[PDB]
Amino acid sequence: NECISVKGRIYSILKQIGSGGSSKVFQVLNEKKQIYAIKYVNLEEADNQTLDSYRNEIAYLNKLQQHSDKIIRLYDYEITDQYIYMVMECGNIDLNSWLKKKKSIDPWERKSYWKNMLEAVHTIHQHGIVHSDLKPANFLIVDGMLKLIDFGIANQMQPDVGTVNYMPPEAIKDMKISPKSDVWSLGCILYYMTYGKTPFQQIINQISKLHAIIDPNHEIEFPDIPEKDLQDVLKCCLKRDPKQRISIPELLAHPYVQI
């Protein structure tokens, strides 16, 4: 029977649906029995690099959210020295959880989702943000459109160890990073949605997998399919050289989404 003020308004906690370092997410209801998500962050052992990174996501999320409804809707927020509360639209499920469940994947639905992902990533690119670690859990389903819910500015949040399967090959060759890197990661999300597995899912051993990713002579298999346009989008996304790899503006003019 627990409850939360944000800016005056009192929200009744249904269940918790996410948790991270200091962070919890809750499905909640206002007085009027309407549903929301509230991200709570606990600032009590947080150093200034952590605090500034949080301040940054809020600032950017607030701004970005008015240029696209493919970015999550942030309704309001509270921030003190001890905590952060962020009230936002509640989604049905995160994309990752839904891909694991879903055996079959409907061609038209796949295309609506691709477009949603493109519009989102395109948005952040326009405002200077290169995520470079996109994966399915970064997106929510909210009335059958995907919405971006993380921006690679602060600790990734777990739906109540993470993969390396979506990692771009320049991430691994560093250690100035390109927006292309996002094209790779979306390329992989589409590849899963196309063929039901990610390109290197079968290589369980991680160092092997990283090698395969960064190896130009490790060919990625593209089984033929009815949508010969989709086959091309996967082929252009998953080029290891960022220079030859396709761009988002290019992707938005591509036949897979346009014809």
Ligand SMILES: CNC(=O)c1ccc(Nc2nc(OC3CCCC3)c3c(-c4ccc5nc(C)oc5c4)c[nH]c3n2)c(OC)c1
């Ligand atoms: C196994 N998991 C499930 O079944 C499930 C997952 C998400 C639900 N809804 C939801 N899950 C969310 O965040 C998740 C936790 C981290 C990833 C998802 C959000 C968020 C959200 C959560 C955290 C965020 N951080 C930022 C910068 O933006 C955020 C937005 C807004 N609405 C949401 N709505 C859900 O319905 C209750 C069920």
Ligand SMILES: C[As](C)(=O)[O-]
């Ligand atoms: C905006 As781009 C050229 O990294 O897809």
